[PDB]
Design a binder for this molecule. Structure first.
Ligand code: NI
Length: 522
């Protein structure tokens, strides 16, 4: 039972992953590496590299994938894609995803020159439409052809979905209309796509076998992490408090969206601890504490001074001291492991986040209706992603310095974009009197209907994505893995804030299929 701490605290004690499995994975990895670098027709190679990514394995082959695509992009030979929408769109997306610029004008030949509308003759090319839809999300601001490609391909895919013969292709198109691949969380999409790929006609059985084995090996790390985190959480006693039922496993599932690789296990555990405390303390500020209790919680945190903590009731004192202790533990890990005391930075982002909660609480108490901009300036902090992302930078940056930490903590556009997206996606996740959420703020500000206000907020999602996309073609003071963390928290937000069955059964199925049950090997 995904929700049961007895079961969770036992996870990791044993695994059905053997040393046999690991040796087999080493052998299969060498052949997949060889397939990516080796001879293939260029469309077949793009399709292979896309499958590797969708199976969750870009982390194993990123150098080979980049080297293969660099080769393909430096081709005098272009007759294999020019005039072929499916090939043009796949090439466009995979090159932009891997830092190789392709201009939007590659799609101009598929438009009517008078209207700028895509040609009627495309309206029944399902794989072309699907590739053009997926490609459109790699667009930047002012790339008008890609804005049109999105609205055209969405409308045409909706129209043709029911006309598709191939049951696998129909499943893929349904999945894409729910969320484009660019917006999906990698680990969750990997588990979905392993089953889809197995049923594809062009399926490579070596790649499928590697995908299953690597999936199970990575899952064994996750199970050991969940065990440690569940034992920690029960140790805090916060599992017994009223707030955030299931906050620990909710946090961890979101963290798997941010980062799933085994080599980032200790970072992931620390991010998951912070996320569990965010959901708990969100409830303290929202429901449980009095204004005097919250002001004292905030002041203690701002001063990093726990002298007055016994003035708080037990159920508020315990979350505060766990936030304090965990923040000190995480800053200390940075000192021991990375040579840099991170406590000033964990304490600062917690103080900022509690200030942002206190401001929401004061707006509610005084019946304030902020503007959308006023709300988002605060709500990009209250969502918790400045806290989580600054922490993740602290823990991973090579050669941490005060200058480097001060720059990320200042939320430059790349980082701020991610934080705003996570907030507005969360707010959109509530289906159609709360003056303090995105849609209602915009309604109060402009007198828009809910429908029109929702469309406006959805347009902001697309805009901020375009800004992220372009930021990734610019030189950055950031490097991997932080560059990936910043994109992947947004994909974790999309995945867990969508709107048969119910939210409970859907979540349980994702947790059980990704974290608990191995994939069956023959
Ligand atoms: Ni459908």
């Amino acid at each position: 039972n995904l929700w049961d701490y007895d079961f969770l605290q036992s996870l990791g004690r044993h695994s059905s992953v053997t040393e046999e499995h690991v040796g087999l994975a080493e052998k299969l990895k060498g052949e997949v590496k060889s397939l990516i670098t080796g001879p293939m027709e260029p469309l077949a190679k793009l399709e292979f590299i896309d499958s590797v990514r969708r199976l969750g394995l870009k982390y194993q082959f990123e150098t080979e994938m980049k080297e293969a695509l660099a080769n393909i992009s430096k081709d005098g030979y272009d007759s294999w894609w020019v005039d072929n929408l499916r090939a043009t769109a796949l090439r466009f997306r995979l090159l932009r995803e891997n830092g190789i610029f392709v201009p939007q004008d590659v799609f101009e030949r598929f438009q009517n020159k008078e209207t700028g509308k895509f040609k009627n003759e495309l309206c029944e090319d399902v794989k072309g439409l699907l590739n053009l839809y997926e490609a459109s999300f790699l667009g930047w601001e002012g790339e008008d052809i890609l804005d049109e490609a999105r609205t055209f391909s969405t409308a045409q895919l909706k129209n043709v979905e029911g006309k598709i013969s191939s049951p696998n292709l129909a499943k893929i198109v349904h999945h894409a209309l729910d969320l484009p691949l660019h917006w999906r969380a990698i680990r969750y999409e990997a588990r979905w796509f392993i089953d889809i790929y197995e049923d594809e006609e062009d399926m490579n059985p070596t790649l499928l076998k590697y995908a299953k084995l690597d999936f199970n090996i990575v899952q064994s790390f996750h199970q050991a992490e969940i065990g440690r985190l569940a034992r920690w959480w029960v140790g805090t006693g916060l599992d017994k408090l009223p707030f955030a039922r299931n906050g620990l496993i909710q946090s961890y599932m979101y963290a798997i969206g941010m980062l799933f690789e085994p080599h980032l296990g200790e970072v992931r555990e620390m991010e998951a601890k912070v996320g569990a405390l965010i959901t708990t303390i969100d409830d303290v500020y929202d429901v449980y504490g009095t204004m005097e209790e919250l002001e004292l919680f905030t002041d203690i945190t701002e001063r990093w001074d726990i002298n007055r903590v016994d003035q708080l009731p037990r159920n508020i004192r315990m979350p505060l001291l766990t936030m304090f202790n965990t923040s000190n533990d995480i800053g200390y890990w940075a000192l021991k492991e990375r040579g840099f005391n991170g406590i000033p930075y964990t304490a600062k982002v917690w103080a900022d986040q509690l200030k942002s909660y206190t401001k929401e609480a004061k707006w509610f108490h005084e019946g304030h209706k902020p503007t959308l901009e006023e709300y988002l300036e605060n709500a990009l902090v209250s969502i918790g992603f400045p806290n989580l992302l600054v922490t993740s930078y602290l823990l991973t940056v090579d050669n941490p310095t005060k200058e480097k930490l001060d720059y990320v903590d200042s939320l430059p556009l790349f980082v701020r974009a991610s934080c705003i997206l996570c907030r507005i996606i969360n707010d959109l996740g509530t289906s159609p009197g709360d003056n303090l959420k995105s849609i209602q703020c915009y309604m109060n500000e402009t007198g828009a209907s809910q429908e029109v206000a929702r469309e406006h907020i959805e347009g902001l999602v697309r805009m901020w994505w375009k800004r992220l996309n372009k930021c990734l073609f610019e030189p950055s003071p950031f490097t991997e893995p932080f560059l990936s963390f910043t994109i992947n928290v947004v994909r974790g937000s999309h995945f867990f804030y969508q709107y048969y069955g119910n939210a409970e059964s859907w979540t349980k199925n994702q947790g059980m299929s990704v974290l608990i049950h191995p994939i069956t090997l023959d």
